[PDB]
Amino acid sequence: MLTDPIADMLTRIRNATRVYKESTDVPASRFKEEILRILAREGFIKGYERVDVDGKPYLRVYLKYGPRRQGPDPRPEQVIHHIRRISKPGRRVYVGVKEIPRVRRGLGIAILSTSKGVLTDREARKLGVGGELICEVW
Amino acid sequence: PTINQLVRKGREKVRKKSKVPALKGAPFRRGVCTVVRTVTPKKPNSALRKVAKVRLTSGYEVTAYIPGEGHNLQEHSVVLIRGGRVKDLPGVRYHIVRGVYDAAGVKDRKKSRSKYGTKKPK
RNA sequence: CAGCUAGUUGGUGGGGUAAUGGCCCACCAAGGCGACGACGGGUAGCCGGUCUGAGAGGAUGGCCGGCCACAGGGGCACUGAGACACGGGCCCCACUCCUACGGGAGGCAGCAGUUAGGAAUCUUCCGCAAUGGGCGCAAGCCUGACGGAGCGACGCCGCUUGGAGGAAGAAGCCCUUCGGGGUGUAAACUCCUGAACCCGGGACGAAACCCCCGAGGAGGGGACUGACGGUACCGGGGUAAUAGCGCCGGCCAACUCCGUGCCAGCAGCCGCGGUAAUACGGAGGGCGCGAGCGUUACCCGGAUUCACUGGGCGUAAAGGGCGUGUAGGCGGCCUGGGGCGUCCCAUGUGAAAGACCACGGCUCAACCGUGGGGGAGCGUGGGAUACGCUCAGGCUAGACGGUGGGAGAGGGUGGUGGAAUUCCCGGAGUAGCGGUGAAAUGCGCAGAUACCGGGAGGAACGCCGAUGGCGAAGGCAGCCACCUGGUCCACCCGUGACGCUGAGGCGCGAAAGCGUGGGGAGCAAACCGGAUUAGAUACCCGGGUAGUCCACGCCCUAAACGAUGCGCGCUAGGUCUCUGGGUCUCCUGGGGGCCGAAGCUAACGCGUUAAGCGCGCCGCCUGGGGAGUACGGCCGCAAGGC
RNA sequence: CCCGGGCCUUGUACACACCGCCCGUCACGCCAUGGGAGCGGGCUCUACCCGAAGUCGCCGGGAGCCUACGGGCAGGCGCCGAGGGUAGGGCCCGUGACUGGGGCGAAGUCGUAACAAGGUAGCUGUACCGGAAGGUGCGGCUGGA
RNA sequence: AAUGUAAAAA
RNA sequence: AGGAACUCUGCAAGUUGGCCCCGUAACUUCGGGAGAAGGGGUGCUCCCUGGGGUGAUGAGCUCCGGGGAGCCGCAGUGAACAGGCUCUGGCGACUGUUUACCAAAAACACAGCUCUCUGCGAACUCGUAAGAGGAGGUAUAGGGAGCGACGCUUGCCCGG
């Protein structure tokens, strides 16, 4: 039945990055888009694009990574080190603009839904709106 | 647990409990000596301690330690109770207070007289 | 504490009230409340705030301010704008006092003072001068509200016990390798300064009410009054003028000596003392703080040790024995209306005091004045609509269904087959058999054992058989037929989000055990005998009843174990095996195993059958013992279970 | 095979280390606690009998007083009523001859169940049984080989 | 093929 | 007046007594315990009102009743009939049975448990016998014995 399509997507990306895939797909959905769109615009992913598995709308999400490392375990540093859903289905989180979180002292982002649209933490303050704190990413 | 489980059942409060029924949780309680006696210590030590069973204002009847060397307590000494157990002695949750009522101070103590009710030597 | 309720819930009319109302009454109707915790018990005045805390939180309501409640205990009404009235009234109770016995007086939880209780908590002061209140036209009267002084290191704050010089360093005291080291610039001494004390001056807090002019108003003008107090403060004079407490093993800053000897003692935790203690006690010295320093008590901290922030549950404490499922919780993809949640703006409110900032007042400071800012929260209005919700519309990826197939110790019922054990009948046969570590008990000339034939009966199903299969768990194995549950695969045909989880509930639930009736071969608690041993209520041997088997009913526990709740999505592969589909050394699905990517883990270890990465929902944990005990409640025939 | 020793491996609840550890009964003492003929106390509920003050309703008549006579006050009764009394239940606390087990205690008596095949693998539900640990039966688990 | 108390680790 | 002080003993007697209403403990085999206990009502008059039977649907007659206001006495089931209650032991489960005429009980009996005999021309009983009962029954039946509802249980000894 799949509980939270969002947490899923976020997770799909986390599970994929760790193994360094080039792109994991995800079941398509308008609201899901924005998350990517922003997530990409800020520089967390090379990009995304609609696709189709055996007659099912999905989304390719081309992952970004750091350069190779020297020494034991040439594991390439991540571009997404951290990603986590805040407002869950079993606990909706809502914040006023006068109280929106600063992810990793500004290094990080905090995407969130709002009456004006899905916006970054900063863009939230920009247009001065609060909303459902979706998740943060750094 | 889930959040929902919290929204139901919820978090049980610690609720601690006392170590001294000096009653009214007062700072001290008066009483009369019922019996002045000397008792053997516990598991790892030994040395007959100076103790007395006191009847409380609070209708009780507790055993209490007489600190310091030598004392003057007898089967009718009124005295002040202080509370503080003793690792060495089985069930003894109170100290007597030297230097109040019929309980003298430690004779001739020069160091730390405050804890042994002893006046300042000239 | 799991059910509660007769004015109980509602109505009609009526009383009463400032007024609504079962507030109270007559009749009527049968209703109202409860796991979103009723009813019951225990506790408690509530808030502004105070305390701690990084905060979220926790704890708390002293003094000040706000509201409520009470005035020895209880009931009542009277007067009135208002009371059910602390210093008014009536009655009953208890207590006090007066009495000529008939009767009568009283209520400090107002300010003081007393007493009792207690660890403990103040002067029977002064003043209406200010401020405020009541009456008065006014003068003025009353004002234990209030302004003040008095007592207590109870708290916070300022200050004093002196400042500079002053020996290769007095004496004393402690230590010592007997040279010396320490207290130590410390002292003495020298000069300086001058708390206390003394003399002179001496407030602010106080202008108004009042009276004159102006009208008695606006406006101007005049005068009276200070409890604190001859105090604050200013001026002059002026003496070197209280230091204490805790600690010095580790946490923890501070080390030596004597005494002592599991004694005397210490103790917050760990521990310390049993002749040589930096841990007892004294000394010398040192660390810490200083008009204080310690102790006890309680609150928040540490304690992310109830975890929202911010924890867990394979083995550490913790997954419910297993399923079905009620309530609740949670809910895939597209579009539309509403705008509840949610976000924004505007305004109202959020008293004062307090907290923080700034600046000013008292020599500083505490304390105080003024001004500033924000504040959660709720009320009204306006607006945004992404996520949540909600109505409406569409879809097929979830789930279910059709059709066709498959493996299977899944369940029930009837029947059935062979092997062995045992007993019995028959024969043939004789001197032992059996059993053990060894042996005895035991059986056997009344003919056992060993062998052949015959019969009765009960239980369990060898090989196949497995590292195997099925089931939700418990569990399920000869064969056969019937009745029936689950699951898997192919086709992509139907439904159209119908889903997931699940407190309570209900059903299943090894073995042992219980009831009634049956059955009884083998086995076997208990029970008896043998042997072993110090003993042997045991291990070994001979015997042997319930039970084990069936029906029906009850019990409901477990190492009910993968010691791992279920559902879904995601995250390298290698190999073995069970089952299905496909022209097939291959692939694709469902199951059971091993080794391993990444990753997780305290380690052992786990690893697409996760203990990895995520979300939903339930269950559980919160030091060891006491204890799965006790009390209560429920269930049970009982044992006993929850 | 007895004794001492070396290397590898395995089990452990041992670690001044098997001259280790360790269990239950009994005996002694201390402590808290449950039961127990009962005893005593507090709070509460129900039903009833008595019932002050007082408001409210009726009367105010064979009588009193005021009366502008229409009425009013006193007085009479009634309903409610503090509280008392009676009887019967509920909760909670204290106490009780004796009795159950539990905790603790430098040393006691008995044996040695467990920890190594602990010298019968252990552990477990349950049932019987025995001075005590235990044993045995049925099944179940490896936390055994 | 039973058992060995009770004071030793800067 | 006292209220069991009587006395082996509250023996005898007194108390209580019907009906309606309220109310009612432990324990329990869930039926009980219960009439537990404790209390209230009880007469006559006047008024309004419900249901039933007869009949006709009403009247009369009759049956049961509900409410309001008042009267009298020491007293209203006014006389007669008419439970004293409670707690706690023993025995026996229980209703029953018995010593006609000194014993009604803890004695017998009882449903129920166990042992044992008996295969039918049964065993057993009466009879010398024929015969009869058993039974026109057939082991879930019949005779004998002990124990005696129900619950828990019923150990060891086979020398005589």
Ligand SMILES: [Mg+2]
């Ligand atoms: Mg790459």
Ligand SMILES: [Mg+2]
């Ligand atoms: Mg950019």
Ligand SMILES: [Mg+2]
């Ligand atoms: Mg000792």
Ligand SMILES: [Mg+2]
């Ligand atoms: Mg002495």
Ligand SMILES: [Mg+2]
């Ligand atoms: Mg003496």
Ligand SMILES: [Mg+2]
């Ligand atoms: Mg002296």
Ligand SMILES: [Mg+2]
């Ligand atoms: Mg000391």
Ligand SMILES: [Mg+2]
């Ligand atoms: Mg009623």
Ligand SMILES: [Mg+2]
């Ligand atoms: Mg009305």
Ligand SMILES: [Mg+2]
């Ligand atoms: Mg009024």
Ligand SMILES: [Mg+2]
């Ligand atoms: Mg009412």
Ligand SMILES: [Mg+2]
């Ligand atoms: Mg009304």
Ligand SMILES: [Mg+2]
């Ligand atoms: Mg009424």
Ligand SMILES: [Mg+2]
């Ligand atoms: Mg309540």
Ligand SMILES: [Mg+2]
């Ligand atoms: Mg409070």
Ligand SMILES: [Mg+2]
């Ligand atoms: Mg506030």
